[PDB]
Each structure stands twice: as structure tokens, then as C-alpha cells.
């Protein structure tokens, strides 16, 4: 049952470190693509399976290296992951959405054959930090064929996204760049009631929490992508009946349980 299932039965512990797949990396040079600023593809190797794809945007004034740990972590659990560099480090959220859109098309159509051989382009998702998270919400509204969206410490001036794409937002309690009461929580609240949605808020963390290995980001991001990109119900356990001391808030419409 479930053609998209990959990897062993998950444990919490297993989801805080790199997963069972070996990872290869491919550098996409800035000048080799129009529509975004290149970046790095992390993707499984040593295997004949295909996997869903994820495009992920860094945040404000940031480079793709800021999310390298997470690009690798996701890929190691069975995903083809392109972490972009933006055309300019100063690009805003809706610009980042357009470049996510270009990056997804690049992964499907123009990436190396080794990468395309590992990709099922029918199952794609998006994630991003800060302003990249705002871009993630924008693209999920523009393109509802996406399987999932994970905005990390997101920032946007628009607060309402009418999307049917399942959304998990990570806020940071002590974020002063994108205070959750002004960004993350309004985004969560304003999503359609019918859309499966989860908000998790990290105790004591600030805006830079996504820029380094973080156990909670790892668990919630892997689990949401597995549940929606792979239809993998083994990962519902981490997302349902949650009682997680790393969190200082938790909200859900419980559509995914
Ligand atoms: Cl913009
Ligand atoms: Cl398409």
C-alpha cells in the first residue's frame, strides 16, 4: 500500500538527524538559469527510487548556504531539494515566490539527468525562511497543484493567502524580525478553514533559528513533507496529539489526523 512510501518506520529521534538515503549535491550556477539565482540541489543517490521535489528559498539578505543543513536533511530522508539563491539578496517575498516557481520548473525540465532520474515531478512542495516563507505562502496561493508548503519564521506584508495547499508554519517565540503576532499567527489564522494547517511556535527561538540544525524544525518539516508529498500516514503520529516541550504554542484545524 502507498506507492510513494520510502524509508523505514520513523522514530522522533531518527527525524532529528540525516535520514537513510545517501545524498548527492549539484551546484546550479547563477548565470546558468533565468528566473532565479541558481542554488544547490540535494538529492538521493545509491537508489533506484523516485522522490518528490521541494524548492526552498532563504531569507532576507541571505544565501542558500543558510539552509544547507535543511536541504541536506530533507534530501537524506528521501526528497529532491533545490535551495535557491535569489536574483538579488534584497528581493522581497513575492519576488521570491516567482523565483520558487522558476526553480520548480527548472527541477522538472532542465536539471541534470541524474537529478531528473530521482524526481517524481508530479509531487512538488515549497519551503522558505523569512521573506522566503512569505514567498512560500504566495506561491501556494498562485499554484495549488503544490502538495505542501512550510513557511519558516515567515514575513510578508500581505496577511491572507487563499490556498488549498496544506500549510505548516513554524514561528519563533522571540522573533523580532518577523514577530509572530504580526506575521506567522495572522498567516495561520487567515488560511482557509477547509485547508489542513498547523502552526508550531518554538520556545525561546529567534528569527535565526532556521539557519542551523534545529530538532523541532527537522521533525515538523520532514513530517509535513512526508505526510503530503508522499501521502505517508506513518508521519501523522508526529503531527497529531502533540505534546512537545520545545513548543510554546500549537494550533491546528486537525484535518490531517
Ligand atoms: Cl517582492
Ligand atoms: Cl508544469
What does this structure look like?
This protein has 257 residues and is α/β, with parallel strands linked by helices. It has one domain: Rossmann fold, CATH 3.40.50. 25% of the residues lie in helices and 23% in strands. It contains six helices and nine strands. The chain has helices at residues 68-76, 93-109, 113-116, 131-142, 184-190, 215-229, and strands spanning 22-28, 39-45, 51-57, 80-84, 119-129, 149-152, 167-172, 197-202, 247-252. Strands 1-2-4-3-5-6-7-8-9 form a nine-stranded mixed beta sheet, sandwiched between helices. Helix 2 (93-109) packs across helix 4 (131-142). It is globular and about 45 Å long. The two termini are 19 Å apart. The site of one chloride ion has 4 residues, from helix 2. This is Leaf-branch compost cutinase. GO terms for molecular function: acetylesterase activity; cutinase activity.
Structure keywords:
monomer, 257 residues, alpha/beta, Rossmann fold, nine-stranded mixed beta sheet, 23% strand, globular, binds chloride ion, Leaf-branch compost cutinase, AB_hydrolase_fold, signal, serine esterase
Number of domains: 1
Can you say what the CATH homologous superfamily is? Alpha/Beta hydrolase fold, catalytic domain
Q: Report Rg.
A: 16 Å
Give a count of the beta strands, DSSP E runs of length 2 or more.
9
Strand content: 15-25%
Describe the sheet with the most strands. Answer: 9 strands, mixed
Distinct ligands, ions and cofactors found in the model: chloride ion
Q: Say what the CATH topology is.
A: Rossmann fold
User: How would you write the strand order of the largest sheet?
Assistant: 1-2-4-3-5-6-7-8-9
CATH domain class name: Alpha Beta
Q: Which CATH architecture is right?
A: 3-Layer(aba) Sandwich
Amino acid at each position: 500500500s502507498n506507492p510513494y512510501q520510502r524509508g523505514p518506520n520513523p522514530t522522533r529521534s531518527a527525524l532529528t538527524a540525516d535520514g537513510p538515503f545517501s545524498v548527492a549535491t549539484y551546484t546550479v550556477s547563477r548565470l546558468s538559469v533565468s528566473g532565479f539565482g541558481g542554488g544547490v540541489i540535494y538529492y538521493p543517490t545509491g537508489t533506484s527510487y523516485t522522490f518528490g521535489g521541494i524548492a526552498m528559498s532563504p531569507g532576507y539578505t541571505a544565501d542558500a548556504s543558510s539552509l544547507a543543513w535543511l536541504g541536506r536533511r530533507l534530501a537524506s530522508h528521501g526528497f529532491v531539494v533545490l535551495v535557491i539563491n535569489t536574483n538579488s539578496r534584497f528581493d522581497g517575498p513575492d519576488s521570491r515566490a516567482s523565483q520558487l516557481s522558476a526553480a520548480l520548473n527548472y527541477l522538472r525540465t532542465s536539471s541534470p539527468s541524474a537529478v531528473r532520474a530521482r524526481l517524481d515531478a508530479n509531487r512538488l512542495a515549497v519551503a522558505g525562511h523569512s521573506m522566503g516563507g512569505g514567498g512560500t505562502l504566495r506561491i501556494a496561493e498562485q499554484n495549488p497543484s503544490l502538495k505542501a508548503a512550510v513557511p519558516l519564521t515567515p514575513w510578508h506584508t500581505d496577511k491572507t493567502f487563499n490556498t488549498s495547499v496544506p500549510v505548516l508554519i513554524v514561528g519563533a517565540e522571540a522573533d523580532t524580525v518577523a514577530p509572530v503576532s504580526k506575521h506567522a499567527i495572522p498567516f495561520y489564522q487567515n488560511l482557509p478553514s477547509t485547508t489542513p494547517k498547523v502552526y508550531v511556535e518554538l520556545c525561546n527561538a529567534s528569527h535565526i533559528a532556521p539557519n542551523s540544525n534545529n530538532a523541532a524544525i527537522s521533525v515538523y518539516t520532514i513530517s509535513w513533507m512526508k505526510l503530503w508529498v508522499d501521502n505517508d500516514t506513518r508521519y501523522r503520529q508526529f503531527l497529531c496529539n502533540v505534546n512537545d516541550p520545545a513548543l510554546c504554542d500549537f494550533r491546528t484545524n486537525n484535518r490531517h489526523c
